[PDB]
Design a binder for these strands. Structure first.
Ligand SMILES: Nc1ncnc2c1ncn2[C@@H]1O[C@H](COP(=O)(O)OP(=O)(O)OP(=O)(O)O)[C@@H](O)[C@H]1O
Ligand SMILES: Nc1ncnc2c1ncn2[C@@H]1O[C@H](COP(=O)(O)OP(=O)(O)OP(=O)(O)O)[C@@H](O)[C@H]1O
Ligand SMILES: [Zn+2]
Ligand SMILES: [Zn+2]
Lengths: 464, 465
RNA sequence: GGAGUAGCGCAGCCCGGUAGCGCACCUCGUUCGGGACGAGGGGGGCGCUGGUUCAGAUCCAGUCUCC
């Protein structure tokens, strides 16, 4: 057996690594998947981090209904309940594709004065956006995510919120997933329908395609107006609130897999990996007892350092087999504990990134955290390298067509949907975002030639 | 203040306290609710506790699909059905999961091959839909959050041990965290889970006398294994079906918390699951608003340092007496009253939602609270116990029975026949709560039909939620 | 033009005989420092619907499905 190399067929690589690492499996219903323990463990760590962040910024979790009145909101990407309770529903119900509406409805009745603001809500849950074609974590009918919703008195506080969150998403990606990203602004064609504008963080997968890791929307008074959400300000004036919306789904897991995965399988970032150190004991019948005891002692010492450790006791498998399994599963470090090692009060530390090294057993606990960090740092620097190595400034549409086969294309655009739409029908590439810290440039649209829009180059790429 | 007293109309008391304490609100769709922050905070603490307990017992969370193939369930009333999706009409209509046994079975069928593949120790935190067009927050709603565990074993014994391991967890959650007393027992054939061999449960008594099923744990034998073809080759070369179990606890547990300890002043939350354990209320006047608030702010840090979940109520817009009532309504166990005066004397007033009032040095507080919170929990539980005892009654005649099922628990003898049981329910509207595990050995005659007593002990009866 | 046969990958159909092989899985022993070895085993009735036949993955007719 093996594993289709990325260069041969990335899509297959992806699908197989997901299956073999037991991250997920396919559900009986088309477009639906089953997230197995190891994969779900990753999602939990993401929840934990984001949740802490959201909390430190005054948000509070709540839980709104799965079912939304159709009238609020048959659209294609919508699953509809029509039968329920045996009889046929008066009005057909939609399975939430997002929660803005229902929350708006409730906000309408909860918000009265400026004392009811700001509204800082977050909800962890599932949503359904129909798709009969499957692709684990990247595009599925049902999927888990976190969707935040806030309501403000002023348009300024709202926008500061929109940014605050995108930065959180970015911190999650950079300091925890070691996934580099571009903080930017979607174009009119690419933004959220009901939003005024949409901010996003874009990542580059090892296959060159781009991925939207998370979005943060400024909704202005669209929903306030649509759902009548007003309040009496301090100046005794009854005005409309300004709402924002932000969300990150398990697609972020897909990003992790496609940003660091190699031909041996997964490579999970230390800060989010279910298992950080996997201990693989190595023995013969006469060594087993004493060797396993050491392993368990080591397991304790590591658990104490607050590390996430796993001891692979499975006796039905050989050391070499295990070495592979865990490399497949992306565990950052492996500790090989054999009789020779045990004899010399040492052990071997093999890094998923590459290399083995011998160290004494007692030193191991204190030394792993730092090594784990160094591990993180490396992963990130390599991803960075990869990104730069695949981002390119295109001036001639011919250069553009070439660069969007490799990765990011930094071109100019007229800011015309019609043109944008054409570039996609042609090269399939799309607008990823108008980067915020992007250098100021003025030129002419790469495909139609009309004066450059956005006063800076737009990030283009074939995306997921 | 207009909180309908429990004795006047419990149902209204319940509904209003939920509204006023901002635990939840009604959603636009019939039977659906919205869990507001404060209420959801409670659910989160429950998750936290249960999950640590599930984890220490080797379970692992996973996430299975919301949509289940109708054929798997073979439209049954309690189901919500998707028929339209993607614009076109579905080939086969999809059911919104009312529970996950089936889909997990399907998956288990393909994952399990060897005994080395068992046990399967799975748990899933999520939502499920069981249609109901009539609403009652946390007690009975169309959609609701819960935790549903599923395990697969090689032997029936390991499976049954799992079934009791979990019910005990549920019971520990109720007793050591919710301070809600409960009876660990076994449902009767009429009252068990359809697909289960047998059903274990924990039963609680609400302040209105009605009973509530806080959590269940089922032994499914080989029903699903067989239904979904879940076999494996054992150490003995023999191929066989696995033995699966199932257990679940929903946010109905919140309803239990509300109805077990709630009083006419409103909620009374058990300290171990309360989102706010201590509320600081600074009392002052402009010429002291600076020093009081300074101390209050300081005490806040001192308390957070202790890991205590505290909330400071600065709200200058409101009067002390107003805040006092709000926090008694929302159930906060303790209140610290920090006044202009007592700060120079260095003392403060600690007031417990249970009638305690004491003065203590601000310095002693941080350290003293933890133990007090414990003493609190104990008392909550003590009272609930007392209530239940005062509302449980051994009956030997069907007249006494009818009387006792108006007050609470009725400990009657039964024949063991579903027919009689369904009769007792048609007449008295009472049902079987459970056949207690630790009940005292007793033989007698069915409280209604006269025939010799089954179970070898008294069955717990009651009007239930 | 091919192909739907065990979880996965395949052969068997021409010249009908009651289903086979690799991987995986179960047993036992030997192994164990980079995916072990031997022997012994378990699991499907061949996409679906007809038909011919003593007998049908195999022959005939037809239908569905992926390239
Ligand atoms: N089908 C899907 N499967 C998984 N995650 C998704 C899916 N669609 C969107 N997401 C995630 O949900 C987040 C918020 O949803 P949003 O509506 O902003 O995205 P979207 O426009 O649906 O994205 P795309 O169309 O690129 O999938 C996205 O940033 C992404 O992480
Ligand atoms: N409609 C509901 N709303 C909230 N929680 C519920 C609801 N139905 C059941 N639960 C919770 O889910 C747990 C497991 O559900 P299960 O299918 O065993 O219940 P059930 O037999 O339908 O309940 P009951 O006996 O109360 O009708 C119950 O112990 C309870 O805590
Ligand atoms: Zn153009
Ligand atoms: Zn009887």
């Amino acid at each position: 057996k093996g594993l289709t190399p990325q260069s041969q067929d990335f899509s297959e690589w992806y699908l197989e690594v997901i299956q073999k690492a037991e991250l997920a499996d396919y559900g009986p219903v088309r477009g639906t998947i089953v997230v197995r323990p190891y994969g779900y463990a990753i999602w939990e760590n993401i929840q934990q981090v984001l949740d802490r962040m959201f909390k430190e910024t005054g948000h509070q979790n709540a839980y709104f209904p799965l079912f939304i009145p159709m009238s609020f909101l048959f659209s294609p990407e919508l699953a509809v309940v029509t039968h329920a309770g045996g009889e046929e529903l008066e009005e057909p119900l939609a399975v939430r594709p997002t929660s803005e509406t229902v929350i708006g409805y409730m906000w309408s009745k909860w918000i009265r004065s400026w004392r009811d603001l700001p509204q800082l809500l977050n909800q962890w849950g599932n949503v359904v956006r129909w798709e009969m074609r499957t692709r684990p974590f990247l595009r599925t009918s049902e999927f888990l995510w976190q969707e935040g919703h806030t309501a403000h008195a002023t348009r300024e506080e709202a926008e500061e919120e929109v940014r605050r969150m995108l930065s959180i998403y970015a911190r999650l990606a950079r300091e925890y997933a070691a996934i580099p990203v571009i903080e930017g602004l979607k174009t009119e064609k690419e933004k959220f329908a009901g939003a005024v504008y949409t901010t996003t963080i874009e990542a580059l997968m090892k296959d060159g395609k781009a991925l939207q890791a998370g979005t943060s929307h400024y909704l202005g008074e669209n929903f306030a107006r649509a759902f009548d959400i007003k309040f009496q300000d301090r100046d005794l004036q009854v005005k409309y609130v300004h709402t924002t919306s932000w969300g990150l789904s398990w697609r972020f897991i897909g990003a992790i897999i496609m940003t660091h995965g190699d031909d041996r399988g997964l490579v999970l970032p230390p800060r989010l990996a279910p298992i950080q150190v996997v201990i693989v004991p190595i023995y013969k019948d006469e060594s087993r007892e004493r060797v396993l005891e050491a392993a368990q002692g080591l397991r304790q010492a590591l658990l104490a350092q607050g590390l996430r450790v796993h001891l692979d006791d499975r006796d039905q498998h050989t050391p070499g087999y295990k070495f592979h399994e865990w490399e497949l599963k992306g565990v950052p470090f492996r500790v090989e504990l054999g009789p020779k090692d045990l004899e010399g009060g040492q052990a071997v530390l093999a890094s998923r990134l590459g290399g083995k090294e011998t160290l004494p057993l007692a030193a191991l606990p204190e030394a792993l955290p730092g090594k784990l960090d160094a591990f993180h740092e490396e992963l990130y620097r390599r991803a960075l390298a990869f990104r730069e190595d695949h981002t390119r400034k295109v001036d001639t549409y011919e250069a553009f067509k070439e660069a969007v086969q490799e990765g990011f294309a930094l071109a100019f655009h007229c800011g015309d949907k019609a043109c944008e739409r054409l570039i996609q029908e042609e090269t399939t590439a799309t607008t990823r975002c108008v980067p915020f810290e992007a250098e100021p440039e003025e030129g002419f649209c790469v495909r139609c030639g009309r004066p450059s829009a956005y006063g800076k180059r737009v990030v283009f790429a074939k995306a997921y």
